Amino acid sequence: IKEMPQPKTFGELKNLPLLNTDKPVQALMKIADELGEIFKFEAPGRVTRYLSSQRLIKEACDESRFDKNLSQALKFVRDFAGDGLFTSWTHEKNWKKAHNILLPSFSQQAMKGYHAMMVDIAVQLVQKWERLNADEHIEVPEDMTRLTLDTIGLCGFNYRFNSFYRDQPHPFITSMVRALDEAMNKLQRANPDDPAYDENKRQFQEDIKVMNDLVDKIIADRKQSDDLLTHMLNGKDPETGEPLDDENIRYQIITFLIAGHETVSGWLSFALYFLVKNPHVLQKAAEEAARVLVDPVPSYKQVKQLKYVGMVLNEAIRLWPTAPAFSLYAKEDTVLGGEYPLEKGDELMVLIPQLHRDKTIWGDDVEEFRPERFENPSAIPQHAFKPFGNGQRACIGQQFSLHEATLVLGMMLKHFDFEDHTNYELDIKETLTLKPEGFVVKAKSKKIPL
Amino acid sequence: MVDIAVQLVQKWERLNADEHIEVPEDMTRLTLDTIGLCGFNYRFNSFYRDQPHPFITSMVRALDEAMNKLQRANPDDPAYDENKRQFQEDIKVMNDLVDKIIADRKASSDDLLTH
Amino acid sequence: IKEMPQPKTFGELKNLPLLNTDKPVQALMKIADELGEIFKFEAPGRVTRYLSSQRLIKEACDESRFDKNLSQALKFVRDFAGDGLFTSWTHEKNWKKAHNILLPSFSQQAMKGYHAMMVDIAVQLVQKWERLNADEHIEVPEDMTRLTLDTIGLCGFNYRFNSFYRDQPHPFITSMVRALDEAMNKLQRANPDDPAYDENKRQFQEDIKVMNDLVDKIIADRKASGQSDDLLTHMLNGKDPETGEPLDDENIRYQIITFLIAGHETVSGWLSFALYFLVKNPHVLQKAAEEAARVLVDPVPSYKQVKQLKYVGMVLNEAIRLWPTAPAFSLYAKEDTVLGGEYPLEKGDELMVLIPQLHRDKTIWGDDVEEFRPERFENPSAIPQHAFKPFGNGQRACIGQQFSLHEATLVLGMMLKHFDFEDHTNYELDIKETLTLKPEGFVVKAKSKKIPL
Amino acid sequence: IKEMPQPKTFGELKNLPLLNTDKPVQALMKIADELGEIFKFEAPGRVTRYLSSQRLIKEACDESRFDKNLSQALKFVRDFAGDGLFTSWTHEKNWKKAHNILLPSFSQQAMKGYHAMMVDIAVQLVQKWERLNADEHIEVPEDMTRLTLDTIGLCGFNYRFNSFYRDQPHPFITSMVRALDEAMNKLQRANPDDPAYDENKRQFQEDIKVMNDLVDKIIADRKASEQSDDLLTHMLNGKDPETGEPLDDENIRYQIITFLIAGHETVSGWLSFALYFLVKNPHVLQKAAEEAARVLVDPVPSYKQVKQLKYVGMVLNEAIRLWPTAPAFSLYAKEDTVLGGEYPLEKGDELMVLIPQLHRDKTIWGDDVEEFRPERFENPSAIPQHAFKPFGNGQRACIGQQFSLHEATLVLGMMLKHFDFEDHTNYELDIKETLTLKPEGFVVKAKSKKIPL
Ligand code: FDE
Ligand code: FDE
Ligand code: FDE
């Protein structure tokens, strides 16, 4: 039962200066590489422990001892998402209520309903790229969020953002980035009440009104369908017989627009990066897509058969998990790993990109992109691969993402050949999530019609 | 009372043609200004404000807290630390406003506060 | 005498660094104090000469030799005021057309029509100040912009901004301040295409959208739903004698913006400075409150009574002499000429009149040019021509001079009748500069004289 | 019985944002004008109460209940002034020790010895101005630091700084202003250990080494042969009457720094202000030059002649009244006490005397506190006790008080004898704040009266 490592302190500022970058998650990974499986991290008022090894995280994922915690990041995001599924505490009224009301919308059969609409937007993406003249290129992260925002909008709410009819980023997304960017910058503000932050605070509200105005436009377009929005309005709580409060329903819409398109958007962009940097892996998935997608538009069953594309997807999110961390707190007093005592209420952070690079589980080539590690999904021991959270607070849209990413990635491989014409150097922008910045490619159409 | 009521009428007469009226927000503007003037000779000037008076926001959040504590199973859950904080933040603002009313009289009547 | 004075130069940046302050006009007032009646001012790409003495200003006011120029300041205001009266060239189409169409709206026959609506806005201010609690104070420039904006909206467009029902400045006022502040800061950018200014370049546009969204709201309440005889009917219905046609809807919108801005912003500064000199010169305040008690004998002021507030008008004039809230106007050389017999000008050379400096000429105003003595205006005829130019010059002079002076006189009259004013902080005059001038933190406390309305 | 006023608060930062300007003392003077005779000012770890009225300052100057305190400003200057006379606690061994040995260096008999050296520096200033060409001007605070620094150098240590042979300031003054400004800016830092201030910490230390490299130059040039009878002789050889010992090598090092800084910086500010009031108040300037022409009848003035320039001293007294170049001094409560019968104080609580605010108490000086009226100082006996405190209080009052006034009169006497001064720029007073006060960018022109030396 020994003492815990800790990085450099700056007097009364503690460890806060060490995350004084636009890339805090990558700075924590360096500290993890420098200090190991666990280290203590102090801020003016907060203290947290970062876990990097599967040995300690395996006990942290035990729901008998640990419960989902709202990190200082989520408490700031709660300023515009409120008590929706992502930023809710487990033991507060609306998490249980809404979790059970929304869960039918993510069943395997609900996915069959989404498929036609997912195919709608994916065809729009293929048609955008097929109409590029020979000199033009593609901005990967921008066209992916065009697609992922449109999917969550059409399937969830029957609302058309028409992102492909906008050369500019969609206004909802542009202020959302600023709101998520603001939240992350507040984690680095020592004294958030300095007058210097008065422009920053007023812009922050300006961006929330933009997010709420769109939601009221989504609500006004309804009040003919059995989508996710019908379920928010109509589902009863079995114990009380009542539907979700209107203020919560606005909160869940925001949550799904954000969590339901950004992490999928980063995902697809990373998968395209690793393919275009590993050209043999790209032709093996291109062979599978040419084999399985035999129709002008894909069917639901065909997506289920793109086994190798799926492994590409799992190996990308292993290397770069687009939601990079989740937080826990100590239900009751306990000792961690038989060496580290924790009092009730002590907080842990699972550093997901560090868990997925644990040499002791994945072998001594953790940093290489090898999709063939997931040819045997069962081989990997429990709690070693945690890109979607843990337990009852794990990602509810866990199958929706996989189907959307697989379908979209499948059709791109069927219809285009991709050249990394600039020799792109991977640069990971951090909002609270991860995405490659300025990643561009060229796509020669294989001239297969739709 | 007529003082406050005339202020409300004049607010509605000066709206432009396309605008509308949110009734409970303008009613709280009227009734609160009335208790302030009649009770304490104190002018909240609620109709000279766009958003609610800060006393009104802290009061409703305090009343909302009181009602929500009734439905709460496990009152020490970490989910409620913000609530305990915010509750105490809302107590100080209501007392501060009462400190402003009491002190504003030590300057200066035969109203409720005089009794 | 032949060579022209010029301040310190900074390499390929010329004189531009000299204006790196939040207060550029007062910084120019100090260069003139050091260099005299005229000096050359170079920035990367532009050159202008600043005039300060009545001797040269009288020559520049010769309309046969000089015409109104769009200073670099106004060219940037033209990005949202467009082709309106203020930012229009004399010889381009929509100036003379709009001027002839709109001049009837500022005759003093129209002023009597506006008077009832101006009284409306003014009573709302009196009632705000009477309803403050004992400990409260007043923010002077903030409450003056509420009144001046509400007056131009109601009299000009039959529109109510309802600024006294709003805690914060009205949304138009907030974007407009940022648009003027963006303009003022653009005069200092060595490279306006630098990526550093992308948030500025985008923020600037967001604020243009807000002002035009209000202009759409005013026209939405008119050119559909209804019969007024205000400024806007004249914009929609007046015709041009040479062409027979009214103004294009695009220009009308530019004219609405210009009247919202130039018609309240300069006025709110006027009242704030006038009230500043009053609480700093209490005997001038006593004499003005005596005329106000005498003339304003009814519960509400009439048009005839305002025309009789003579000492108040001298205060207002002595205020605008010290701090002319639109602080400069620009001119250029129609043809080659020599100015003052020593400084030649090629055709097209630009001159800028430094109004606060011309108003501080000792050779004209005597030896107490900085004292606030309203009695210098006791016989308005005694002043030399081109000695007092707070409202511009020639045919491009301020079209709203009789409108502003009437508005400023009426409101200052009612405050003096209804309140006693305390400079409870010993306010030190700190004058914020957008493109207009107003004091920044001026506050007072006001004891009500308990006179009914 | 009364709660104490406090200005606007900013969350956990308390009042600290309010002084985030380049002019914190002038910002506190403003806060005093709104909040009155005493207000509490909170910072994250510290609390201080600012006094402005003679009513409360007379009690703070009571040495049985209050003793000199080190404000946060002096605690930072103690980082390079160390244990010297200014930054020591009165209960420290080195204070009474250094006071008793150095106090003789300022007895009247010494002034006669310094007088010859003082004249040397001043004659250099007169002839510097006599050698300016006609178009050139004079930088007032820049030449005054040249004089006072050279004077303390020659009178104190027999060391020639030769400032009039210098480009821009000496390396000591150049390094010292940065050290004093760093000290002033450390007062605004929410968290000092922040990495952003590493360039500042590096630069602050680099400037401390420069100043010591000069005291070491002075010490080495002295013990290299040594029968002087100056202040440095007393530091090295005099023994303390109470303890029989002389000063530490470490402490002699700290006093040399102490005397070079506070002993020229406040004198230079003083003289710049007096010259500002002279060129802005032309009636007092003629009376001062008519007396100086009267008394200074020799090629050089004698000690006896300077002691007779009564009106010149009155100007100096009225200058330092309005702008005490050392703007504040700090006190703490020996034991629990009640201040003003209204505000209770715990033992050790900190008070700040706001000297420019004390000198503007209309209840003591009359209703013309902003007027430069030297005749308040004609019969000093009328002046109520503790109303005029430009040199501190009690046993911790300014030790060089007579030294400074005599130097200031001598120089001010000679400038007036030899020159008429033109305020050719209409300089607008701008008060730069290091930890001391001086006018920034004050310039004049001086036509020589052509009187030989
Ligand atoms: C719609 C959708 C879509 C999606 C996607 C995704 C991707 C790609 C990735 C991801 C992730 C995730 N998630 Fe995700 N997602 C979603 C969602 C969600 C929600 C609602 C949540 C929360 C849940 C609960 O709690 O109930 C999540 C959730 C999630 C998580 C966890 C959180 C915490 O904090 O714990 C993670 C890690 N997600 N994700
Ligand atoms: C409504 C209104 C109001 C007003 C006011 C005023 C005041 C207080 C002051 C003033 C001023 C002036 N203006 Fe003034 N104002 C107005 C207006 C105007 C207009 C529209 C103009 C333009 C004209 C022409 O050109 O046509 C002006 C204008 C003006 C001027 C000139 C500018 C230039 O550049 O030239 C001046 C200086 N204004 N202002
Ligand atoms: C040499 C010299 C010169 C001078 C000058 C002067 C002038 C002009 C002004 C002045 C001032 C003064 N000071 Fe001055 N001075 C000097 C000095 C000094 C010293 C050493 C001191 C210390 C003392 C004790 O004891 O602490 C002083 C001191 C002094 C003071 C006090 C501080 C406190 O905190 O208490 C004051 C306020 N001074 N000052």
Swiss-Prot record, chain A:
* Protein family (similarity comment): In the N-terminal section; belongs to the cytochrome P450 family.
What GO molecular functions are on record for this protein? aromatase activity; flavin adenine dinucleotide binding; FMN binding; heme binding; identical protein binding; iron ion binding; NADPH-hemoprotein reductase activity; oxidoreductase activity, acting on paired donors, with incorporation or reduction of molecular oxygen, reduced flavin or flavoprotein as one donor, and incorporation of one atom of oxygen
Provide the function of this protein.
Functions as a fatty acid monooxygenase. Catalyzes hydroxylation of fatty acids at omega-1, omega-2 and omega-3 positions. Shows activity toward medium and long-chain fatty acids, with optimum chain lengths of 12, 14 and 16 carbons (lauric, myristic, and palmitic acids). Able to metabolize some of these primary metabolites to secondary and tertiary products. Marginal activity towards short chain lengths of 8-10 carbons. Hydroxylates highly branched fatty acids, which play an essential role in membrane fluidity regulation.
Induction statement: By pentobarbital. Expression is negatively regulated by repressor bm3R1 at the transcriptional level.
> What are the protein's UniProt keywords?
Cytoplasm, Electron transport, FAD, Flavoprotein, FMN, Heme, Iron, Metal-binding, Monooxygenase, Multifunctional enzyme, NADP, Oxidoreductase, Transport
List of residues binding (9Z)-hexadecenoate: 50
Q: How is it used?
A: This protein is a target of protein engineering. Its selectivity-directing and activity-enhancing mutations have been extensively studied and the designed mutations allow this enzyme to act on non-native substrates and/or in order to enhance production of synthetically desirable end-products.
What would changing residue 187 to Q do, according to UniProt?
Answer: Higher activity in the hydroxylation of highly branched fatty acids
Q: What is this protein called?
A: Bifunctional cytochrome P450/NADPH--P450 reductase
Location of the protein in the cell: Cytoplasm
UniProtKB/Swiss-Prot annotation, chain B:
Q: Which cysteines are joined by disulfide bonds?
A: none
Give the UniProt subcellular location, in the record's own words.
Answer: Cytoplasm
What is its biotechnological use? This protein is a target of protein engineering. Its selectivity-directing and activity-enhancing mutations have been extensively studied and the designed mutations allow this enzyme to act on non-native substrates and/or in order to enhance production of synthetically desirable end-products.
Induction remarks: By pentobarbital. Expression is negatively regulated by repressor bm3R1 at the transcriptional level.
Q: What is the effect of changing residue 70 to Q?
A: Higher activity in the hydroxylation of highly branched fatty acids
Domain of life per record = Bacteria
Chain's role: Functions as a fatty acid monooxygenase. Catalyzes hydroxylation of fatty acids at omega-1, omega-2 and omega-3 positions. Shows activity toward medium and long-chain fatty acids, with optimum chain lengths of 12, 14 and 16 carbons (lauric, myristic, and palmitic acids). Able to metabolize some of these primary metabolites to secondary and tertiary products. Marginal activity towards short chain lengths of 8-10 carbons. Hydroxylates highly branched fatty acids, which play an essential role in membrane fluidity regulation.
Record-stated family: In the N-terminal section; belongs to the cytochrome P450 family.
Which protein, by its recorded name, is this? Bifunctional cytochrome P450/NADPH--P450 reductase
Gene name of this polypeptide: cyp102A1
